[PDB]
Design a protein around this ligand. Structure first.
Ligand SMILES: C[C@@H]1CCC/C=C/C=C\[C@H](O)C[C@@H](O)C/C=C/C=C/[C@@H](OC(=O)CCC(=O)O)C/C=C\C=C\C(=O)O1
Length: 359
């Protein structure tokens, strides 16, 4: 039915299981679908937050998704454009008057979504003496007192800061907090059953944590240094991340639940970066690739097995979602790990797409 070589599932399971046996992976889980129907899904290993003993990693285990939160923020911004409350070419200074100054006055909402606003990767918590970084009025003022790294449309520079600003813009346009809007108009509207900005207490023991810092953050009521959780901070499960990726592949709809129009998703999924722009990530330059309206179009094509047009997004954790529209294929995974290793996060993509068969 799904037209998938099941020998690659054994290769995928054996790949994750070997890393868990060698000690460079506590747990691992994945979920893949053809035509909107999951045909393979497995969870491996156990986890501990360093203060307990191991408990079984399951397919419905809740875990922080990190940068995947940016995809929720992107959907929320585009929902407000559909309503006529925002425009992508709006200068940020129109919404946040603290941006009406040299440098910041040229930043538009489009720049924030595409990481071309010239912002640094992140803001400083050390130089913020006596500043409440979780307070929105002070975090913005401290931001505009920091010089910009580039001018607008000068380079693709991945920035946690850009999407915190988007979360503030959402808050100022809708009259409610960023977390309230996303919860109402995305989480409950798409029907996500195990997705929370703050896990209820009856579910905290069901959250996969691999460090004490993750246990500490699980009990926290706010982000430790941001006025919102628009760049990171969402807890979710495989099934919910799969639904979000399927919503994009179906161009805004998931059966009876609709989050966006199909023309809006088509805009989100086409390359929005000017040609020739240099790409940077954490100060280090990376290979140039397509990037949409908060959605990554790289890696795809070239020497990768994913078809051109495959959209994706990764998150520190690690986790990721990859959907191939040409193959009607979607793959999401949880690989909880503290350090990054391409053999543990990127290599399984070769194993999965090598199993895709015709039809
Ligand atoms: C291709 C690229 C992913 C490749 C990452 C490679 C790093 C290489 C060497 C490094 O030295 C090893 C890593 O520890 C350094 C990684 C830095 C990335 C941090 C995150 O920032 C976030 O907001 C995470 C949110 C959160 O933690 O709550 C970024 C999250 C996803 C990135 C997506 C993307 O842009 O795709």
């Amino acid at each position: 039915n799904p037209a998938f070589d099941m020998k690659q599932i054994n290769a995928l399971n054996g790949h994750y299981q070997t890393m868990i046996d060698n000690g460079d992976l506590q747990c691992a889980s994945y979920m893949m679908s053809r035509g909107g129907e999951v045909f393979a899904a497995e969870s491996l290993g156990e986890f501990t937050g360093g203060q307990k003993e191991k408990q079984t990693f399951q397919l419905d285990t809740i875990r922080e998704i990190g940068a995947l939160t940016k995809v929720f923020t992107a959907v929320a911004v585009m929902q407000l454009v559909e309503k006529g409350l925002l425009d992508l070419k709006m200068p940020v200074k129109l919404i946040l008057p603290a941006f009406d100054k040299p440098g910041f006055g040229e930043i538009k909402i489009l720049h924030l979504l595409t990481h071309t606003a010239g912002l640094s990767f992140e803001l400083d918590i050390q130089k913020a003496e006596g500043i409440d970084l979780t307070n929105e009025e002070e975090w913005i003022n401290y931001l505009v007192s920091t010089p910009l790294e580039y001018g607008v449309d000068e380079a693709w520079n991945y920035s946690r800061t850009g999407f915190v600003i988007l979360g503030i813009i959402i808050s100022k346009v809708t009259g409610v907090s960023y977390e309230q809007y996303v919860t109402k108009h995305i989480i409950e509207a798409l029907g996500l059953e195990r997705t929370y900005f703050y896990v209820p207490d009856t579910l905290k023991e069901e959250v996969c944590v691999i460090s004490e810092h993750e246990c500490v953050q699980l009990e926290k009521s706010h982000h430790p240094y941001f006025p919102n959780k628009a760049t990171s901070g969402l807890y979710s499960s495989l099934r919910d991340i799969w639904k979000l990726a399927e919503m994009f592949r179906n161009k805004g709809r998931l059966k009876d639940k609709k989050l966006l129009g199909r023309k809006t998703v088509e805009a989100m999924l086409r390359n929005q970066i000017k040609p020739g722009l240099p790409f940077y990530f954490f100060g280090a330059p990376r290979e140039e690739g397509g990037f949409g309206l908060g959605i990554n179009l790289w890696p795809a094509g070239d020497h990768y097995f994913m078809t051109e047009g495959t959209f994706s997004h990764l998150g520190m954790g690690w986790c990721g979602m990859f959907s191939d529209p040409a193959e009607d294929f979607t793959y999401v995974f949880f690989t909880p790990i503290s350090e990054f290793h391409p053999h543990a996060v990127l290599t399984p993509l070769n194993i999965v797409w090598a199993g895709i068969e015709l039809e």
